[PDB]
DNA sequence: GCTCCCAGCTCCCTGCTGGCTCCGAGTGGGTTCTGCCGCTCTCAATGG
RNA sequence: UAACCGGAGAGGGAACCCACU
DNA sequence: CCATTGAGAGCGGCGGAGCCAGCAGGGAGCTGGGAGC
Protein backbone atom coordinates (compact mmCIF):
# COMPACT_ATOMS: atom_id res chain seq x y z
CA UNK A 1 0.00 0.00 0.00
CA UNK A 2 2.93 2.43 0.16
CA UNK A 3 3.96 4.71 -2.09
CA UNK A 4 7.41 5.60 -3.17
CA UNK A 5 7.95 8.64 -5.69
CA UNK A 6 8.96 7.33 -9.42
CA UNK A 7 12.16 9.77 -9.84
CA UNK A 8 13.53 7.15 -7.29
CA UNK A 9 12.51 4.03 -9.22
CA UNK A 10 13.82 5.30 -12.66
CA UNK A 11 16.83 6.21 -11.05
CA UNK A 12 17.95 3.17 -9.71
CA UNK A 13 16.72 1.04 -12.81
CA UNK A 14 18.22 3.38 -15.48
CA UNK A 15 22.15 2.57 -13.61
CA UNK A 16 21.04 -1.17 -13.60
CA UNK A 17 20.82 -1.03 -17.30
CA UNK A 18 22.69 2.01 -18.03
CA UNK A 19 25.89 -0.09 -19.83
CA UNK A 20 24.17 -2.34 -22.11
CA UNK A 21 24.22 -4.92 -19.72
CA UNK A 22 22.58 -5.91 -16.47
CA UNK A 23 24.63 -4.88 -13.50
CA UNK A 24 23.59 -6.41 -10.54
CA UNK A 25 23.39 -4.43 -7.33
CA UNK A 26 26.28 -6.69 -5.70
CA UNK A 27 29.98 -6.99 -5.82
CA UNK A 28 29.90 -8.11 -9.21
CA UNK A 29 28.50 -5.90 -11.00
CA UNK A 30 29.29 -2.73 -9.19
CA UNK A 31 32.89 -3.25 -8.77
CA UNK A 32 33.35 -4.57 -12.26
CA UNK A 33 32.21 -1.43 -13.68
CA UNK A 34 35.18 1.65 -14.50
CA UNK A 35 34.89 3.75 -11.29
CA UNK A 36 38.34 3.77 -9.97
CA UNK A 37 39.83 1.72 -7.40
CA UNK A 38 39.45 4.08 -4.21
CA UNK A 39 35.55 3.80 -4.44
CA UNK A 40 35.79 -0.01 -5.03
CA UNK A 41 37.81 -0.79 -2.13
CA UNK A 42 35.29 1.29 0.06
CA UNK A 43 32.07 -1.69 -0.90
CA UNK A 44 34.34 -4.87 -0.61
CA UNK A 45 37.09 -6.89 -1.05
CA UNK A 46 39.05 -3.49 -0.54
CA UNK A 47 42.44 -5.30 -0.94
CA UNK A 48 41.88 -7.58 -3.63
CA UNK A 49 41.24 -4.84 -6.01
CA UNK A 50 43.94 -2.55 -4.71
CA UNK B 1 10.93 3.67 25.91
CA UNK B 2 15.21 4.18 26.65
CA UNK B 3 16.06 5.71 23.17
CA UNK B 4 19.13 7.25 22.82
CA UNK B 5 19.92 10.21 20.48
CA UNK B 6 23.65 11.21 19.30
CA UNK B 7 24.40 15.41 19.07
CA UNK B 8 26.78 16.55 16.84
CA UNK B 9 28.18 20.36 17.00
CA UNK B 10 29.21 21.96 14.07
CA UNK B 11 32.71 23.74 15.14
CA UNK B 12 32.42 26.60 12.69
CA UNK B 13 30.45 29.05 10.90
CA UNK B 14 30.66 27.69 7.74
CA UNK B 15 29.18 24.20 8.95
CA UNK B 16 26.59 26.20 11.49
CA UNK B 17 25.22 28.24 8.27
CA UNK B 18 25.35 24.80 5.78
CA UNK B 19 23.37 23.39 8.80
CA UNK B 20 20.62 26.05 9.26
CA UNK B 21 20.16 26.62 5.62
CA UNK B 22 20.36 22.51 4.62
CA UNK B 23 19.23 20.53 7.35
CA UNK B 24 16.62 22.38 9.72
CA UNK B 25 13.98 20.83 10.78
CA UNK B 26 11.30 22.58 9.41
CA UNK B 27 13.18 22.83 6.07
CA UNK B 28 12.45 18.92 6.30
CA UNK B 29 9.00 18.56 6.75
CA UNK B 30 7.94 17.23 2.94
CA UNK B 31 9.77 14.35 2.36
CA UNK B 32 10.82 14.09 -1.28
CA UNK B 33 10.50 10.23 -1.37
CA UNK B 34 6.39 10.18 -1.29
CA UNK B 35 6.32 13.92 -1.59
CA UNK B 36 4.16 14.12 1.54
CA UNK B 37 4.94 15.36 5.36
CA UNK B 38 7.29 13.38 7.49
CA UNK B 39 5.58 15.17 10.61
CA UNK B 40 2.09 14.76 11.62
CA UNK B 41 -0.13 15.43 14.85
CA UNK B 42 0.36 11.71 16.25
CA UNK B 43 -0.68 10.87 20.09
CA UNK B 44 -2.53 12.18 22.72
CA UNK B 45 -2.94 15.53 20.53
CA UNK B 46 -4.41 13.48 17.72
CA UNK B 47 -6.69 12.02 19.89
CA UNK B 48 -7.57 15.29 21.59
CA UNK B 49 -8.22 17.21 18.54
CA UNK B 50 -10.97 15.28 16.73
CA UNK C 1 6.75 -15.48 14.61
CA UNK C 2 6.64 -12.16 14.97
CA UNK C 3 9.61 -11.81 17.21
CA UNK C 4 11.21 -14.16 14.97
CA UNK C 5 10.83 -11.82 11.69
CA UNK C 6 11.44 -8.93 13.82
CA UNK C 7 15.03 -10.05 14.37
CA UNK C 8 15.73 -11.35 10.89
CA UNK C 9 13.99 -8.27 8.95
CA UNK C 10 16.56 -6.15 10.93
CA UNK C 11 19.89 -7.55 9.69
CA UNK C 12 18.17 -8.70 6.40
CA UNK C 13 17.08 -4.76 4.98
CA UNK C 14 20.02 -3.36 6.69
CA UNK C 15 22.47 -5.05 4.01
CA UNK C 16 20.20 -4.02 0.86
CA UNK C 17 20.52 -0.13 1.98
CA UNK C 18 23.78 -0.74 2.25
CA UNK C 19 24.15 -1.99 -1.54
CA UNK C 20 22.27 0.38 -2.84
CA UNK C 21 24.26 2.92 -1.85
CA UNK C 22 27.53 1.84 -2.83
CA UNK C 23 25.84 1.50 -6.23
CA UNK C 24 24.84 4.69 -6.14
CA UNK C 25 26.33 7.36 -4.87
CA UNK C 26 27.65 10.05 -6.81
CA UNK C 27 24.97 10.14 -9.14
CA UNK C 28 24.33 14.07 -9.14
CA UNK C 29 22.64 16.80 -10.89
CA UNK C 30 24.74 19.29 -12.92
CA UNK C 31 24.46 22.52 -13.83
CA UNK C 32 24.19 21.13 -17.47
CA UNK C 33 21.01 20.11 -15.47
CA UNK C 34 21.64 15.96 -16.28
CA UNK C 35 22.14 13.30 -14.08
CA UNK C 36 25.81 11.89 -14.60
CA UNK C 37 27.77 9.73 -11.89
CA UNK C 38 31.28 10.32 -11.11
CA UNK C 39 32.90 9.10 -14.44
CA UNK C 40 30.90 11.95 -16.09
CA UNK C 41 28.94 9.49 -18.22
CA UNK C 42 25.19 10.29 -18.85
CA UNK C 43 22.77 8.55 -16.81
CA UNK C 44 19.33 10.56 -17.29
CA UNK C 45 19.21 13.27 -19.45
CA UNK C 46 16.99 15.29 -16.91
CA UNK C 47 16.42 14.08 -13.73
CA UNK C 48 13.44 12.36 -13.21
CA UNK C 49 12.37 12.40 -16.55
CA UNK D 1 32.20 -35.76 32.12
CA UNK D 2 33.26 -34.45 29.27
CA UNK D 3 36.36 -32.49 30.51
CA UNK D 4 37.71 -34.95 32.85
CA UNK D 5 38.17 -37.28 30.15
CA UNK D 6 40.17 -35.39 28.13
CA UNK D 7 42.05 -34.07 31.43
CA UNK D 8 42.55 -37.86 32.51
CA UNK D 9 43.91 -38.62 29.28
CA UNK D 10 46.61 -35.96 29.40
CA UNK D 11 48.19 -36.63 32.70
CA UNK D 12 48.45 -40.26 31.80
CA UNK D 13 50.28 -39.00 28.74
CA UNK D 14 52.17 -37.03 31.12
CA UNK D 15 53.13 -39.99 33.60
CA UNK D 16 54.02 -42.05 30.19
CA UNK D 17 56.60 -39.73 29.29
CA UNK D 18 58.03 -39.43 33.04
CA UNK D 19 58.13 -43.12 32.96
CA UNK D 20 59.98 -42.83 29.50
CA UNK D 21 62.51 -40.03 30.47
CA UNK D 22 63.75 -42.52 33.38
CA UNK D 23 63.26 -45.86 32.57
CA UNK D 24 65.82 -45.25 29.57
CA UNK D 25 68.54 -44.39 32.12
CA UNK D 26 68.38 -47.59 33.12
CA UNK D 27 67.50 -45.64 36.73
CA UNK D 28 64.09 -46.16 37.96
CA UNK D 29 61.09 -43.91 37.77
CA UNK D 30 58.99 -42.46 40.86
CA UNK D 31 55.14 -41.35 40.20
CA UNK D 32 54.86 -38.38 42.62
CA UNK D 33 57.09 -36.69 40.40
CA UNK D 34 55.34 -37.27 36.87
CA UNK D 35 51.81 -36.67 38.28
CA UNK D 36 51.41 -33.67 37.16
CA UNK D 37 48.75 -32.12 39.12
CA UNK D 38 48.30 -28.79 37.08
CA UNK D 39 46.44 -31.04 34.39
CA UNK D 40 42.93 -31.26 35.95
CA UNK D 41 43.33 -28.55 38.80
CA UNK D 42 44.10 -26.24 35.64
CA UNK D 43 41.93 -27.63 33.03
CA UNK D 44 38.95 -27.14 35.25
CA UNK D 45 39.20 -23.97 36.68
CA UNK D 46 40.24 -22.57 33.15
CA UNK D 47 37.40 -24.15 31.02
CA UNK D 48 34.72 -23.07 33.69
CA UNK D 49 36.34 -19.81 34.14
CA UNK D 50 36.62 -18.84 30.37
CA UNK D 51 33.63 -20.69 29.24
CA UNK D 52 35.29 -22.75 26.37
CA UNK D 53 34.98 -25.65 26.67
CA UNK D 54 37.87 -27.22 25.46
CA UNK D 55 41.90 -27.05 26.19
CA UNK D 56 43.31 -23.55 26.28
CA UNK D 57 45.55 -24.82 23.37
CA UNK D 58 42.80 -24.79 21.23
CA UNK D 59 39.98 -22.76 22.74
CA UNK D 60 39.01 -21.02 19.30
CA UNK D 61 37.92 -24.42 18.71
CA UNK D 62 35.81 -24.72 21.64
CA UNK D 63 32.29 -23.84 22.43
CA UNK D 64 32.07 -21.13 24.09
CA UNK D 65 29.64 -19.19 27.25
CA UNK D 66 28.99 -22.64 28.03
CA UNK D 67 29.67 -20.98 31.86
CA UNK D 68 28.87 -17.41 32.15
CA UNK D 69 28.67 -15.60 35.59
CA UNK D 70 25.76 -15.57 37.36
CA UNK D 71 23.49 -12.70 37.26
CA UNK D 72 22.91 -11.07 40.68
CA UNK D 73 20.46 -8.54 40.18
CA UNK D 74 17.26 -9.57 41.46
CA UNK D 75 16.44 -13.08 42.84
CA UNK D 76 14.55 -14.07 39.78
CA UNK D 77 17.30 -13.65 37.53
CA UNK D 78 19.21 -15.95 39.53
CA UNK D 79 16.98 -18.53 39.51
CA UNK D 80 16.24 -17.87 36.14
CA UNK D 81 19.57 -18.13 34.53
CA UNK D 82 19.97 -21.29 36.57
CA UNK D 83 17.43 -22.74 34.65
CA UNK D 84 18.47 -21.94 31.82
CA UNK D 85 18.78 -24.37 28.50
CA UNK D 86 20.53 -23.46 25.41
CA UNK D 87 20.21 -24.46 21.86
CA UNK D 88 23.90 -24.62 20.34
CA UNK D 89 22.58 -23.63 16.73
CA UNK D 90 25.05 -20.54 15.76
CA UNK D 91 23.79 -17.46 15.19
CA UNK D 92 23.71 -15.68 11.49
CA UNK D 93 21.93 -18.60 11.24
CA UNK D 94 18.69 -17.24 8.68
CA UNK D 95 16.85 -20.56 9.47
CA UNK D 96 13.40 -20.21 11.73
CA UNK D 97 12.34 -23.80 12.36
CA UNK D 98 15.05 -24.09 15.38
CA UNK D 99 14.18 -20.90 17.17
CA UNK D 100 9.74 -21.82 16.77
CA UNK D 101 8.45 -22.81 19.59
CA UNK D 102 7.53 -26.84 18.96
CA UNK D 103 4.40 -28.01 20.22
CA UNK D 104 6.09 -30.72 21.98
CA UNK D 105 8.00 -28.02 24.07
CA UNK D 106 4.47 -28.22 25.94
CA UNK D 107 5.18 -28.94 29.60
CA UNK D 108 9.11 -28.67 29.72
CA UNK D 109 10.38 -25.46 28.43
CA UNK D 110 8.89 -21.61 29.30
CA UNK D 111 6.69 -20.89 26.12
CA UNK D 112 6.91 -16.77 26.39
CA UNK D 113 10.49 -16.66 28.45
CA UNK D 114 12.84 -16.02 25.44
CA UNK D 115 15.31 -13.49 25.11
CA UNK D 116 14.19 -10.90 21.95
CA UNK D 117 17.48 -10.00 20.34
CA UNK D 118 19.22 -12.18 17.61
CA UNK D 119 18.85 -15.25 20.16
CA UNK E 1 17.55 5.88 0.95
CA UNK E 2 14.02 6.14 -0.60
CA UNK E 3 13.81 2.57 -1.64
CA UNK E 4 15.59 1.18 1.91
CA UNK E 5 13.48 2.81 4.01
CA UNK E 6 9.96 1.45 3.11
CA UNK E 7 11.83 -1.78 2.03
CA UNK E 8 12.89 -2.42 6.06
CA UNK E 9 9.21 -2.06 6.68
CA UNK E 10 7.48 -4.47 4.57
CA UNK E 11 7.48 -8.68 5.29
CA UNK E 12 -0.70 -18.72 -6.34
CA UNK E 13 2.89 -17.95 -4.66
CA UNK E 14 5.04 -15.06 -5.81
CA UNK E 15 7.92 -14.34 -3.29
CA UNK E 16 7.18 -10.72 -2.22
CA UNK E 17 8.82 -8.88 -0.25
CA UNK E 18 12.43 -8.24 0.88
CA UNK E 19 13.03 -12.05 -0.77
CA UNK E 20 11.88 -10.24 -3.99
CA UNK E 21 13.94 -7.11 -3.60
CA UNK E 22 16.91 -8.90 -3.03
CA UNK E 23 15.96 -11.22 -6.58
CA UNK E 24 15.63 -7.76 -8.42
CA UNK E 25 18.68 -6.49 -6.77
CA UNK E 26 20.97 -9.27 -7.45
CA UNK E 27 19.82 -10.05 -10.89
CA UNK E 28 19.54 -13.47 -10.24
CA UNK E 29 19.55 -16.29 -12.61
CA UNK E 30 17.47 -18.81 -10.30
CA UNK E 31 14.56 -16.84 -8.63
CA UNK E 32 11.81 -18.22 -6.74
CA UNK E 33 8.77 -18.66 -8.22
CA UNK E 34 9.24 -17.43 -11.92
CA UNK E 35 5.92 -17.03 -13.90
CA UNK E 36 4.67 -15.99 -17.12
CA UNK E 37 1.45 -14.51 -17.23
CA UNK E 38 0.08 -15.91 -20.64
CA UNK F 1 74.22 -27.82 2.16
CA UNK F 2 71.94 -27.03 -0.87
CA UNK F 3 69.15 -29.07 -0.04
CA UNK F 4 68.36 -27.49 3.53
CA UNK F 5 68.07 -24.10 1.75
CA UNK F 6 64.86 -25.51 0.37
CA UNK F 7 63.32 -25.85 3.14
CA UNK F 8 64.89 -22.53 4.57
CA UNK F 9 62.77 -21.12 1.65
CA UNK F 10 59.84 -22.71 2.24
CA UNK F 11 59.53 -21.40 5.68
CA UNK F 12 60.72 -18.30 4.96
CA UNK F 13 58.14 -18.07 2.20
CA UNK F 14 55.20 -19.21 5.28
CA UNK F 15 56.13 -16.17 6.87
CA UNK F 16 56.71 -13.58 4.36
CA UNK F 17 53.35 -14.59 2.77
CA UNK F 18 51.24 -14.86 6.15
CA UNK F 19 53.00 -11.39 7.31
CA UNK F 20 50.71 -10.12 4.64
CA UNK F 21 47.63 -12.48 4.60
CA UNK F 22 46.79 -14.19 7.42
CA UNK F 23 44.21 -16.87 6.72
CA UNK F 24 45.20 -19.04 3.56
CA UNK F 25 43.18 -21.99 2.33
CA UNK F 26 44.72 -25.16 3.44
CA UNK F 27 47.50 -23.46 5.05
CA UNK F 28 48.06 -23.66 8.54
CA UNK F 29 47.75 -19.98 10.51
CA UNK F 30 50.70 -18.28 11.86
CA UNK F 31 49.66 -18.22 15.61
CA UNK F 32 51.39 -16.77 18.43
CA UNK F 33 52.35 -18.85 21.30
CA UNK F 34 49.48 -18.06 23.33
CA UNK F 35 47.46 -19.86 20.82
CA UNK F 36 46.03 -17.11 19.14
CA UNK F 37 46.18 -16.14 15.41
CA UNK F 38 47.81 -12.84 14.02
CA UNK F 39 46.38 -9.86 12.38
CA UNK F 40 48.05 -9.70 9.27
CA UNK F 41 48.29 -6.53 7.11
CA UNK F 42 45.42 -7.85 4.92
CA UNK F 43 43.22 -8.89 8.28
CA UNK F 44 44.10 -4.70 9.37
CA UNK F 45 41.74 -3.09 6.06
CA UNK F 46 39.95 -6.21 5.14
CA UNK F 47 36.49 -6.11 6.29
CA UNK F 48 34.10 -4.05 8.74
CA UNK F 49 36.44 -2.53 11.42
CA UNK F 50 39.59 -2.41 8.79
C1' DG G 1 51.74 -40.44 -61.68
C1' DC G 2 46.76 -38.29 -61.53
C1' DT G 3 42.51 -36.94 -59.14
C1' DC G 4 39.69 -37.74 -54.87
C1' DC G 5 37.97 -40.68 -50.41
C1' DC G 6 38.39 -41.09 -44.73
C1' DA G 7 40.01 -41.88 -40.36
C1' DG G 8 43.04 -39.64 -37.19
C1' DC G 9 43.93 -35.39 -35.89
C1' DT G 10 43.05 -30.63 -34.36
C1' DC G 11 40.45 -27.36 -32.17
C1' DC G 12 36.25 -25.98 -31.02
C1' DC G 13 32.55 -25.30 -27.25
C1' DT G 14 29.46 -26.78 -23.20
C1' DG G 15 28.99 -28.34 -18.89
C1' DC G 16 30.01 -29.65 -13.75
C1' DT G 17 32.46 -28.60 -9.56
C1' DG G 18 35.73 -26.51 -6.30
C1' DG G 19 37.01 -21.79 -4.08
C1' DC G 20 35.98 -17.33 -2.16
C1' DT G 21 33.28 -13.69 -0.23
C1' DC G 22 29.44 -11.79 2.48
C1' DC G 23 26.18 -11.80 6.08
C1' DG G 24 22.34 -4.20 10.00
C1' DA G 25 23.36 0.09 12.92
C1' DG G 26 24.79 1.70 17.20
C1' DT G 27 25.50 1.24 22.92
C1' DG G 28 26.55 -0.32 28.04
C1' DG G 29 28.66 -3.44 31.31
C1' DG G 30 31.45 -7.74 32.62
C1' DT G 31 35.52 -11.34 33.07
C1' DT G 32 39.59 -13.66 31.17
C1' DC G 33 43.90 -13.41 28.81
C1' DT G 34 50.97 -10.61 27.70
C1' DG G 35 55.21 -18.71 26.40
C1' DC G 36 57.77 -21.96 29.85
C1' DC G 37 62.24 -24.94 30.43
C1' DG G 38 66.46 -25.21 31.01
C1' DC G 39 71.37 -24.97 30.07
C1' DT G 40 75.58 -21.81 30.28
C1' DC G 41 77.94 -17.12 32.12
C1' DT G 42 78.53 -14.22 35.96
C1' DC G 43 78.77 -12.73 41.37
C1' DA G 44 80.76 -12.62 45.17
C1' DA G 45 79.59 -15.94 49.39
C1' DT G 46 82.49 -18.69 51.67
C1' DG G 47 86.07 -23.22 51.92
C1' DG G 48 91.68 -23.77 52.65
C1' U H 1 68.83 54.20 57.63
C1' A H 2 66.25 47.56 55.07
C1' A H 3 62.26 43.69 52.72
C1' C H 4 63.42 34.95 51.11
C1' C H 5 60.83 31.03 47.37
C1' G H 6 58.58 29.27 40.73
C1' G H 7 58.10 22.33 38.76
C1' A H 8 53.36 20.38 35.43
C1' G H 9 48.88 15.96 30.65
C1' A H 10 49.31 12.78 32.02
C1' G H 11 47.79 7.18 29.95
C1' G H 12 47.74 0.69 27.57
C1' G H 13 46.72 -3.05 23.39
C1' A H 14 44.33 -7.85 22.38
C1' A H 15 40.04 -11.55 22.75
C1' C H 16 35.00 -13.28 24.82
C1' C H 17 29.49 -13.42 27.21
C1' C H 18 25.29 -10.37 28.90
C1' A H 19 22.32 -6.53 27.99
C1' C H 20 19.79 -1.94 25.63
C1' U H 21 17.04 0.61 21.13
C1' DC I 1 95.47 -13.72 48.84
C1' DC I 2 93.61 -17.78 46.52
C1' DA I 3 89.23 -20.61 44.34
C1' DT I 4 85.64 -24.33 43.19
C1' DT I 5 80.93 -23.44 42.89
C1' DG I 6 75.64 -22.53 44.63
C1' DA I 7 72.86 -19.22 43.22
C1' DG I 8 71.19 -15.32 39.93
C1' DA I 9 69.69 -14.41 35.84
C1' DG I 10 69.26 -14.43 30.81
C1' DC I 11 68.91 -16.39 26.15
C1' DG I 12 68.58 -20.52 23.12
C1' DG I 13 65.32 -23.86 22.55
C1' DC I 14 59.89 -26.14 21.85
C1' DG I 15 26.77 -21.97 8.00
C1' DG I 16 24.61 -20.93 3.56
C1' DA I 17 24.21 -18.84 -0.63
C1' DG I 18 26.14 -17.27 -5.09
C1' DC I 19 29.92 -15.88 -8.87
C1' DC I 20 34.50 -17.31 -11.83
C1' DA I 21 38.49 -21.00 -12.51
C1' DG I 22 39.62 -25.98 -14.18
C1' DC I 23 38.58 -29.79 -16.19
C1' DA I 24 36.50 -33.35 -18.94
C1' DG I 25 33.51 -35.02 -22.36
C1' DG I 26 32.33 -33.88 -26.91
C1' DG I 27 31.57 -32.43 -32.10
C1' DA I 28 33.05 -29.67 -36.84
C1' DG I 29 36.01 -30.07 -40.13
C1' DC I 30 41.63 -30.46 -42.31
C1' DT I 31 45.28 -33.70 -44.41
C1' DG I 32 48.09 -37.53 -45.26
C1' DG I 33 47.62 -42.18 -46.99
C1' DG I 34 44.79 -45.28 -49.70
C1' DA I 35 41.27 -46.02 -54.12
C1' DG I 36 40.30 -46.01 -58.71
C1' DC I 37 41.96 -44.02 -62.67
MG1 LIG J 1 11.70 1.94 21.91
Same mark, same amino acid.
Given at each position: ?50 | ?50 | ?16 ? $? ?31 | ?89 ? $? ?28 | ?38 | ?50
Amino acid at each position: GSYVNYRHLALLCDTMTCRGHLMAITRHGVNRQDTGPLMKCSFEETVDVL | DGDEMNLHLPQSLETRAEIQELAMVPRMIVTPQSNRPVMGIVQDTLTAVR | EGLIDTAVKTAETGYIQ $RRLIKSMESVMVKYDATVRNSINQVVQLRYGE | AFLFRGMFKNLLKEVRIYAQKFIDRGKDFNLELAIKTRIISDGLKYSLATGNWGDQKKAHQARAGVSQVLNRLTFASTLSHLRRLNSPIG $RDGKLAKPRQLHNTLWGMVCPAETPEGHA | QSLGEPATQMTKNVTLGVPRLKELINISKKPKTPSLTV | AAHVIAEDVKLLQFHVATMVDNELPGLPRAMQKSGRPLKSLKQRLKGKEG
